[PDB]
Amino acid sequence: ASGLVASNLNLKPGECLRVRGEVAPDAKSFVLNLGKDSNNLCLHFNPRFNAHGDANTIVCNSKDDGAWGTEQREAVFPFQPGSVAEVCITFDQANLTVKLPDGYEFKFPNRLNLEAINYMAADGDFKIKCVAFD
Amino acid sequence: ASGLVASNLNLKPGECLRVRGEVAPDAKSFVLNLGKDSNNLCLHFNPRFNAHGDANTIVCNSKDDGAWGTEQREAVFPFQPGSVAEVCITFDQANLTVKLPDGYEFKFPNRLNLEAINYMAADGDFKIKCVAFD
Known part of the structure; x- marks a missing residue:
């Protein structure tokens, strides 16, 4: 019952990926994953409203050949359950940039x-x- | 090596899918497939610039458990190589509507x-x- 899954995106360095979606009204958190496949994620974007012990915190992580890396938490939280939110992602060999x-x-x-x-x-x-x- | 593939769309009757893309400068034909899965398509939307004996004709077909249905051809071809084109597909119980x-x-x-x-x-x-x- 998960969300949309897209393959063959062929997003190249410098290209801008804009994703707009509706955050469920009863969402305790939501996830947008980007990578090579489900076991290799360059970006596990996870805003948590009230989930896994965190409150209003965006948690990001990577997944390499199945292994989760060290999480990084962001400084802001411009999200609300039951509302439309758009994020824009771009990347280069060193970093992904998320707006x-x-x-x-x-x-x-x-x-x-x-x-x-x-x-x-x-x-x-x-x-x-x-x-x-x- | 191919094009975008999206699953878990959960597009219901009355809902519309808008697809915008760039037609290659030397395009021979392109396809937009919609359905349950790759072998069960309610719509194989195939604009043919120069392919399979067709010259600038939109060919549509269904695919039931891997078997192609009876092709339908349209009377117009509003597609031009090297230009952006947008198509809107609405899903309904009886028919799909293509704009x-x-x-x-x-x-x-x-x-x-x-x-x-x-x-x-x-x-x-x-x-x-x-x-x-x-």
Whole structure:
């Protein structure tokens, strides 16, 4: 019952991936994953409203050949359950850059050294409404 | 090596899928497949610039458990190599409605009696720039 899954994205360095989706009204958190496949994620983007012991904190992590890396928590939280949110992601060999609804942007290390992002998946609390490549 | 593939779309009757992409400068044909999965398509949307004996003709077909149905051909071809083109597909119980770049609309019967579209795949000389799932 998870969310949208997309493969063969062929997102290249410098290209902008814009993802707009509706955060479920009863969401305790939501997830947007990006990578090569489900076991190799260059970005596990996980805003947590009240989940896993965290409150209003964006948790990011990488997954390499199945192994979860060291999480990085962000400084802001421009998200609310039951509302539309858009994020924009770009990357280079060193870092991924994520821009949030509030115009705030941060970087997350490209630990898989990806030269292309072909996989994206949202969970059941983030209903993707549109994806743009520019 | 191919085009974007999206699953778990859960597109219900009355909902519309908007797909915008770039038609290759030397495009011969491109495809947008919609359905339950890769072998069960309620809509194989195939604009053929120069392919299989067709010259600038939109060919549509269904695919039931791997078997191609009876092809349908349209009377217009609002696609031009080297230009952006957008198509809007609405899903309904009886038919799918396709609205072309110039506003021309046509319907294709929902032969498989799908109650929802969960699969979308792009192929050929068409680079997807954005998809909206509403």
